[PDB]
Subunit: 221 residues, 4 copies
């Protein structure tokens, strides 16, 4: 996946119920340390018995059978963006919370002191500023990072709000030490659902933090 | 509807996922003043464009057509218990909240100072206590009252909890000045959904507060 | 319940997607002889392991907890109207078919030769005609009957069509030997779903057939 | 996409409710010619106003936004496999039917005399047989082809049944004149739904028939 073309980005002025992206990155993500799965719905997911402000049962669809059937009996660390509309867990379950990926092993992958990662932000060409985000992992999911990133740029520069977004075309770029960089679009198609936009966090993409760099390119229209 | 017979009561011990009753009465009720309806799904429900911590659209299924098309264009006051699991609003809507009844006209029915209604609580036959609850309406909905009554006894004497109840069989009774008393069971059938147990709040039963009394009958087991 | 008032009747010209009532009575109802339930979802329904053109699992919402847990272990006969849209049976089942009531004991209640029951149909006051329907039960469900009744009047005098109805206001009336006659409006509220209009078959109402009569009141407008 | 490794194939013996695959290819596909779209739920789908034995509304999710907003106003031919369970179209419509892909232009692309396509089938290494399938299109969808190809083998050699299959691992392969051949696994992961398995028909893949070949590889066990 190579650098995006200016016509391939979705534009924030065509999205209708745009806000539905706000709450996602404004609210509190899901965080669980050293926990083990206990049952699964389909071959490619895993269910956990954990709680939060609006749930006591969680689900995370993974990339495929081979992956799910890998973390099935291991201890892992969860960190993910959740949705409540359109989420199934079990016939007998009200109060559910779905998510995509966000799964990392627990032992060894934890660090003593927080690694400092730097984000560079460009707007209309000009590189305008810099800020930091942390993490207690040697191998974090692009999900944990992308989130933390936006959170900041939403409560300060204002990436999303309960209404029209200030910018128009935005996307985050990951730059791994070994190879091939990738990106995510900051805005969805005209009409959409949450459950669908978040599928990007399906591949449970993980990467070393000690050697990865991030870039953000926004457009003021 | 005459006084219930001791076998006709649902027994707390039998219910399985009982907690789900707890949240309904330990959380914050939906409250809106002087608001009007803006669209309706089926012939007997009205939909409001209001907001809260977990929504931005609301639905209240009333008793029947004739009723709904009566409050279809009036300004009213909403006071009610909501459920998120299995709630339908519009094809394009995430973040909804549904309820039953809880509708009263807005003009006049309001009061300067809060009427004081007294509740007599029995337990294993002996009337051990009494407490108070308020209201700013001349014609309140037995729902507004039912709620307020439980929230208390739950936070203090412990009616419901994040698990098994302390008591076994409980119900509330209303005594209207004009005639015919009625009651609600405090526990649902063994296996149930939220949206089904609440239907007792479908008849949008209203009544004068200046002359109505309340009684609670619990059995310790 | 006494003879209805000409203003409480739903008027077929107001229903928007009326057709949907057509397929319910113009389709092959469900019919299964001597069978036993095998699992249950909620405390007031029963599930059966039977087959048909569009299903291989069935459910039947009954009146209350007390009624369901009565046919839980008995051999019974099911004759009823089904709906596919909006129907849950188990987390793992596609191809489902739901219904309301239509449950009767099997042993004894069966007859050697079919009883002949006559129906009398009015039309704008005048008693226009008569026709027949059969049954192999001593105690049938008004559902079994109400169905048989309409299916005829729809294929011949066209009660419902893939479209607007020829008549405007009709309802069937039951006259049981002992006491209280009861009726069903032939048309639903303006806007509706199927699972809700069918709820009148929930009281699994049954009666002797050796002494029961029927009447039909329609209005050409 | 190169030839599959005998370990990446799903084994029917591990599948639980496999029958559901059966009905999909043993049932009547959806067929409509020279039609136009009429509204769209999301940004990557299209809705048509057509009718069949179990529906009067149909949907077909496409690859992405740029494809849908391309067949939005053209005259197209739909050929596809449909799923009922879990299918959303509009808040007011029961009787739906969903699909993925299966869309082709209508003018010109039609042939006077049906093109004969030969399929070669292998079984445990040995090329045991060959047969025929027809099509009235210059540019056909791999879906229309894959379907026809199975139905046969199913009603004859018995690919799927209302139960365990006879075979263990199967997959069809397409060999276009220009380049890159591809394949589909005849079987789903152990636990799945219909709507997910069928997503292979999303990329609405299309190829010329005057120059395409097919091959099937099965493994008795």
């Amino acid at each position: 996946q190579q650098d995006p073309d200016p016509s391939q980005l979705h534009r924030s002025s065509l999205v209708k119920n745009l806000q539905n992206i706000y709450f996602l990155y404004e609210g509190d993500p899901v965080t669980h340390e050293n926990v083990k799965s206990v049952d699964q719905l389909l071959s490619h997911d895993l269910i956990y018995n954990v709680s939060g402000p609006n749930y006591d049962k969680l689900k995370t669809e993974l990339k495929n059978q081979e992956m799910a059937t890998l973390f099935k009996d291991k201890n892992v660390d969860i960190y993910g963006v959740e949705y409540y509309h359109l989420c199934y867990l079990c016939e007998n379950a009200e109060r559910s919370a779905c998510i995509y990926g966000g799964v990392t092993n627990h032992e060894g992958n934890h660090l003593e002191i927080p690694k400092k990662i730097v984000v560079k932000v460009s707007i209309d060409g000009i590189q305008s500023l810099s800020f930091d985000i942390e993490t207690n992992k040697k191998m974090v999911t692009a999900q944990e990072l992308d989130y933390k990133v936006r959170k900041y740029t939403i409560d300060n520069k204002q990436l999303y709000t309960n209404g029209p977004s200030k910018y128009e075309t935005g996307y985050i770029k990951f730059i791994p030490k070994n190879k091939e960089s990738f990106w995510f679009d900051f805005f969805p198609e005209p009409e959409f659902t949450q459950s669908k936009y978040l599928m990007i966090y399906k591949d449970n993409e993980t990467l070393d933090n000690k050697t990865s760099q991030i870039e953000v390119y926004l457009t003021t229209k």
